């Protein structure tokens, strides 16, 4: 299995912007997603219960499109490395990484 | 001060199902998940699954699909788990486990009392 | 299936009261900070939350108790230990699914 992302986006200050990663290769069960930061959750798409938010993001991530999510209101605080770690049965995890800087032109 | 009340020892012979409740009180909100964790002798806690407030919806780790089933009575604020055709390895101390606040991400800071399942 | 796995060493702790105890859990893969747990059982009693996220102690629980490490590598610190402290001491993580994955604990016994 290949976990396969843009690896660097740009985004205006102000807008949205959608985070995304594609599992391809593998015919594994897709049981949840997270997405995050190196030391903060954004996200978690529970294929059971659903998405949770994180208290941070509350009011400014939308879920998806599909196991993506959009970031909205950006901020240049925002810009940074972004991961999606894909758990999976039976191949275990998988990790993307996404490069986002925020612009203010 | 939240408290989960399980219900009693069972023995039971091997094939055979258990069911196991436990009833919450002094939760300040309405809405909490719901898990079940349990141990075998000498052994590390094991995650069985989890059911969302209205008991509408659950999931269970992958080796426990197919076995249990958990269901909530919420008139009564207790959760059922049942877990069919009984093997030895099913021995444990089964734990009911939730947590400060209404979604289902985070560590467990409440835990029943635990209720020994003993098969054979 | 591959599932996280969190080997706890050592396997038991003999200390006497007064003495820190450390206690470390090493991770099969990288796994975020926010994702790490605590908990101290002991004998007959249910688990009780000591730390989550990596360092964070809950409710109630003295700042005795320390939680840190980073990636593949965390540890639980008692820096007086004292004699009720007798306990099987598991760490967790949540970040897997919404129970996670245990250790297989570290027995803590307290001499005399």
């Known amino acids: 299995g290949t976990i396969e992302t843009t690896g660097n986006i740009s985004a205006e200050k102000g807008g949205s912007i959608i985070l995304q990663c594609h599992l391809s290769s593998t015919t594994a069960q897709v049981t949840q997603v997270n997405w995050e930061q190196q030391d903060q959750l954004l996200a978690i798409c529970n294929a059971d219960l659903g998405w949770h938010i994180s208290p941070s993001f509350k009011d400014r991530v939308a879920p998806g499109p599909g196991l993506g999510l959009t970031l909205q209101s950006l901020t240049v605080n925002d810009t940074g490395e972004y991961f999606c770690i894909y758990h999976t049965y039976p191949d275990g995890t998988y990790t993307g990484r996404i490069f986002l800087e925020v612009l203010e032109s | 001060e939240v408290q989960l009340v399980q219900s009693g020892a069972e023995v039971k012979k091997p094939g055979a199902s258990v069911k196991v409740s436990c009833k919450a009180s002094?939760?300040?909100?309405?809405?909490?998940?719901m898990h079940w964790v349990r141990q075998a002798p000498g052994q590390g806690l094991e995650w069985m699954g989890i059911i969302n407030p209205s008991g509408g919806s659950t999931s269970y780790a992958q080796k426990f699909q197919g076995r249990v089933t958990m269901t909530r009575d919420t008139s009564t604020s207790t959760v059922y788990m049942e877990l069919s055709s009984l093997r030895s390895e099913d021995t444990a101390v089964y734990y009911c486990?939730?947590?400060?606040?209404?979604?289902?991400?985070?560590?467990?800071?409440?835990w029943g009392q635990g209720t020994l399942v003993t098969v054979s | 299936g591959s599932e996280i796995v969190l080997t706890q060493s050592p396997g038991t702790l003999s200390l006497s009261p007064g003495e820190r105890a450390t206690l470390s859990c090493r991770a099969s893969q990288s796994v975020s900070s926010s994702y790490l747990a605590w908990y101290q059982q002991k004998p007959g009693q249910a688990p009780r939350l000591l730390i989550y996220?990596?360092?964070s102690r809950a409710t109630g629980i003295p700042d005795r108790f320390s939680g840190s490490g980073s990636g593949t590598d965390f540890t639980l610190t008692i820096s007086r230990l004292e004699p009720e402290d007798f306990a099987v001491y598991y760490c967790?993580?949540?970040?897997?699914?919404?129970?996670?994955?245990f250790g297989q604990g570290t027995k803590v016994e307290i001499k005399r």
């Open positions: 486990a939730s947590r400060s606040g209404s979604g289902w991400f985070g560590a467990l800071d409440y």
């Open positions: 967790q993580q949540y970040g897997s699914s919404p129970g996670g994955t």
């Open positions: 996220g990596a360092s």
């Open positions: 002094g939760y300040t909100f309405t809405s909490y998940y």
